[PDB]
Amino acid sequence: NTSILSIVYKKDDLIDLSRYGAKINIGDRVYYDSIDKNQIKLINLESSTIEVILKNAIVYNSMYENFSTSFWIKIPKYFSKINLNNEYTIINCIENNSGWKVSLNYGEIIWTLQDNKQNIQRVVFKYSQMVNISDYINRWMFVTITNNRLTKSKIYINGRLIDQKPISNLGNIHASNKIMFKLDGCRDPRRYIMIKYFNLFDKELNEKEIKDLYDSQSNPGILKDFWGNYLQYDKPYYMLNLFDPNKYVDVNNIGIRGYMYLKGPRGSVMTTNIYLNSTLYMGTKFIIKKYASGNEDNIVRNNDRVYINVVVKNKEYRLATNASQAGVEKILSALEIPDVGNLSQVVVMKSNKCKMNLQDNNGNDIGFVGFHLYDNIAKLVASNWYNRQRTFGCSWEFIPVDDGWGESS
Ligand SMILES: CC(=O)N[C@H]1[C@H](O[C@@H]2[C@H](O)[C@@H](O)[C@H](O[C@H]3[C@H](O)[C@@H](O)[C@H](O)O[C@@H]3CO)O[C@@H]2CO)O[C@H](CO)[C@H](O)[C@@H]1O[C@@H]1O[C@H](CO)[C@H](O)[C@H](O[C@]2(C(=O)O)C[C@H](O)[C@@H](NC(C)=O)[C@H]([C@H](O)[C@H](O)CO)O2)[C@H]1O
């Protein structure tokens, strides 16, 4: 552990777990998420600040010493022309025109190094808002920036190297003893970010260190929604099939003689010059219902035994099948909840992206929920074929409505 700053939530506050015990000053307008307290929200106000004061012994002052930062960030969709050409600082460690900072702009994360003769290098991660389905817009990203003073500054996103710039021509970098987390210079009063697990390291992290940090901070026994938030019970979700992302779930008819299937194409949402995406708030909603989960919270965990409700014309039905139908593929139906009887409905949730393993009432696997083409109709099925087998039809995302995406529901 070469971490010299590691910030985490404790008791309505933030603490440094490092042996260097940074002082952390939090403003009056900083917010912790209700479900995951480590998710910090900063808004576009002067009091929405976190100031981290490093011990003098670890302040960065060197031409030669290698160093890295890591953090998680969730950046809501840019929906206004005032967001074009508005670079704003979010993480400042600049003192007397030397140091480092993280800034944002439309579709960008920017790393800046500035030496004590005001030579700069910027490394920029650009993501497009003109894409069908974005890996990045309003989705948690794991950011890692590494700096080797002889070679390159590198940006990783979700543990993968995205780009790099040579930095060997920079001289002495003397950063601040203060790290200010604050939206600085943002003209849009509605901009916010969410951030967690800010770390500093006194080396250039290697690819394995970065992959292990990614995995270790990911809460791997908790299932995630599309946005990367914790998956929850009693929260309506629009479904995305990762094999066929340009389709959405629909119900042909309710009852044991009906079926669910993937219908295409998705519509689009756009604002000229700002974004052009596939519509996410489409199709049959799924609601994850408590079965074997405990009373302690609404978080869906790996191996939780659940029921799945499906919403059809503002009424809830139960996802179920008759496992005794001929063939490995068990066509799924939307049943009246009272009328399920002895039909298979228990689902084991698995966290890989989200999988749903349908069970019979004896505790035996019926198989992962996916789809099967019956001529041109992609019917939802449970099939032990999936279980026996990178991207299959049994891989799903759950998309709840979110403030940061802004499409009409
Ligand atoms: C290709 C296929 O049909 N796979 C079936 C599998 O079929 C067996 C053989 O492999 C077939 O070649 C053979 O076809 C016969 C026809 O039935 C007959 O009418 C024709 O005239 O002659 C052929 C005889 O050679 O049939 C045999 C057995 O009958 O059988 C298994 C179960 O044993 C599955 O049904 C399998 O289809 C797969 O089913 C799963 C769910 O169980 C799933 O739907 C798979 O579909 C995806 C996926 O969800 O991951 C999604 C895509 O639709 C699919 N691509 C296609 C079909 O274009 C992909 C890929 O197939 C690949 O698996 C991953 O990319 O998978 C589905 O393939």
Between strands 330-331 and 333-335, the pairing is unpaired
Handedness of CA 40, 46, 47, 49 (dihedral sign): positive
* 83 phi/psi in degrees, rounded to 5: -85, -15
Compute CA distances 371 → 107, 157, 329, 386, 398, whole Å.
34, 31, 9, 10, 16
d(CA 139, CA 160): 16
The two tokens of residue 60 are 């960065």
User: How far is 36 from 312, CA to CA, in rounded Å?
Assistant: 31
**119 and 28, same structural domain?**
yes
Question: In whole angstroms, what is the distance from residue 158 CA to residue 156 CA?
Answer: 7
Tell me: do 245 and 282 sit in the same domain. yes
Residue 156 in tokens: 């990783």
Contact between 393 and 371 under an 8 Å Cβ cutoff? The reply is yes
CA-nearest of 279, 303, 281 to 293 is 303
- Give the distance (Å) from ligand 1 centre to CA of residue 355: 20
Boundary-marking domain end, from 192, 225, 258: 225
Cα–Cα dist 27/183, whole Å: 13
Supply the range of the domain harboring residue 137: 2-225
Beta strands at 192-201 and 67-74: parallel, antiparallel or unpaired: antiparallel
Distance of alpha carbon 344 from its chain centroid, rounded? 32
Token pair 């009373």 is found at: 295
> If we measure between CA atoms, which residue out of 101, 90, 104 comes closest to residue 48?
90
Residue 236: asked if its preceding bond is cis (omega within 30°), the reply is no
- Cα 141 versus chain centre, distance: 6
Protein residue with least CA distance to atom 62, ligand 1? 392
CA of 318 from ligand 1 middle (Å) equals: 27
Residue 392 contacts residue 381 (beta carbons within 8 Å): no
Structure token pair of residue 354: 């989200």
**Secondary structure of residue 299 in the 3-state scheme:** strand
Q: What share of the chain is helix, strand, coil (3-state, %, to 5)?
A: 5, 45, 45
Distance of CA 261 to the CA centre of its chain: 27
Helix (H, G, I), strand (E, B) or coil at 406: coil
Are 252 and 127 members of one domain? no
* Nearest-angstrom CA–CA distance, 207 and 222: 24
Element of type H or E holding 169:
none
Domain end (from 179, 210, 225)? 225
Pairing of strands 260-263, 108-114: unpaired
- Number of domains, the chain: 2
121 and 16 co-located in one domain: yes
* Cβ contact 291:307 at 8 Å: yes
| Token duo for residue 66 | 């290698």
Nearest alpha carbon to residue 385 among 362, 347, 345, 358: 358
Contact 144, 72 (CB under 8 A): no
- The reply to whether 174 and 289 lie within a common domain is no
Gap between the Cα atoms of 114 and 223, Å rounded: 40
The residue to mutate among 241, 242, 243, having the most atoms of ligand 1 within 8 angstroms of its beta carbon, is 243
Q: Among 197, 225, 253, which residue terminates a domain?
A: 225
Residue 81: CA count within 13 A, CB half-sphere:
3
Indicate whether 246 and 294 sit together in one domain: yes
Spacing, Cα 351 to ligand 1 middle (Å) = 25
Instruction: Render 197-261 in DSSP notation, one character per residue.
Output: EEEEESS---HHHHHHHHHHTS-TTB-B-TTSSBPBSS--EEEEESSSTT-EEEES-SSTT--EE
- State the closest ligand 1 atom to the C-alpha of 385, by its place in the atom list counted from 1: 42
What radius of gyration, in Å, describes the C-alpha atoms of the chain? 24
Query: How far, in Å, from the CA of 363 to the mean position of ligand 1?
Result: 27
Domain check: are 219 and 236 in the same one? no
Cα–Cα dist 358/232, whole Å = 19
Residues 193 and 275 in one domain: no
Using CA of residue 36, residue 39, residue 40, residue 43, what is the dihedral sign?
negative
Q: Domain check: are 188 and 248 in the same one?
A: no
Distance CA 177, CA 174 (A): 9
Check: CB of residue 61 under 8 Å from CB of residue 205.
no
Pocket test for ligand 1, best of 355, 365, 373, 388 (most atoms within 8 A of CB): 373
Residue 181: give its domain's CATH number: 2.60.120.200
Q: How many CA atoms lie within 13 A of 71 on its CB side?
A: 24
Give the Å distances, CA to CA, from 326 to 155, 271, 321, 323.
Answer: 52, 49, 12, 8
Q: What is the per-residue burial (b if ≥16 Cβ within 10 Å, else e) of 29-60?
A: ebebeeeeebbbebbbeeebbbbbebbeebbb
Residue nearest to ligand 1 atom 55, measured at CA: 373
Q: Say if CB 237 and CB 288 are below 8 A apart.
A: yes
- Got the DSSP string for 300-358? -BTT-EEEEEEEETTEEEEEEB-TTSSSS-EE-EEE-GGG-TTSB-EEEEE---BEEEE
Using a 10 angstrom Cβ sphere, with 0-12 exposed, 13-18 middle and 19 or more buried, the burial of residue 11 is exposed
> How many CB atoms are located within 10 Å of the residue 118 CB?
8
Residue 372 Cα to ligand 1 midpoint, Å, equals 8
Ligand 1 environment, Cβ below 6 A: 243, 328-329, 370-373, 381, 383, 385, 392-393
CA distance 178 to 24: 10
Residues 185-212: b if buried by 16+ CB within 10 A, e if exposed: ebebeebbbbbbbbbbbeebbeeebbee
CA–centroid distance, residue 107 to ligand 1 (Å): 40
User: Burial level of 332, CB count in 10 A (0-12/13-18/19+)?
Assistant: buried
CA distance linking residue 147 with residue 155, whole number of Å: 9
- Residue 386 to residues 117, 267, 310, 334, 364, Cα–Cα distance (Å): 59, 29, 22, 22, 15
Can you give the length of the chain in residues?
409
Closest atom, ligand 1, to C-alpha of 383: 42
Q: Given the structure tokens 């210079």, which residue do they identify?
A: 185
Give the ligand 1 atom nearest the CA of 381.
41
The reply to whether 251 and 215 lie within a common domain is no
- Ligand 1 pocket test: pick from 259, 321, 385, 396 the residue with the most ligand atoms within 8 Å of its Cβ: 385
325 alpha carbon – ligand 1 mean position (Å): 18
Buried b (16+ CB within 10 A) or exposed e, 125-145: bebebeeebbebbbbbbbbbb
**Quick one: which of 336, 405, 369, 297 has its CA closest to 37?**
297
| Resolution, angstroms, 1 dp | 1.8
**DSSP-derived 3-state class of residue 145:** strand
Centre of ligand 1 to C-alpha 368, Å, is 15
Q: Which residues of 74-89 are buried (b: 16+ CB within 10 A; e: fewer)?
A: bbbbbbeeebeebebb
Cα–Cα distances (Å) from 2 to 5, 69, 204, 213, 243, in that order, read: 9, 11, 10, 12, 39
* Statement to judge: residues 406 and 321 lie in one domain: yes
Does residue 275 share a domain with residue 334? yes
- Expressed in angstroms and rounded, the spacing between residue 251 Cα and the centre of ligand 1 is 23
CB 358 within 8 A of CB 366: yes
∠ at Cα 259 (253, 264), nearest 5°?
90
3-class DSSP string for 38-102: CCEEEECCCCCCEEEECCHHHCCEECCCCEEEEEEEECCCCCCHHHCCCCEEEEEEEECCEEEEE
345-360: b or e for each residue (b if 16 or more CB lie within 10 Å)?
bbbbbbbebbbbbbbb
Task: Please report, for the domain that includes residue 349, its CATH number.
Answer: 2.80.10.50
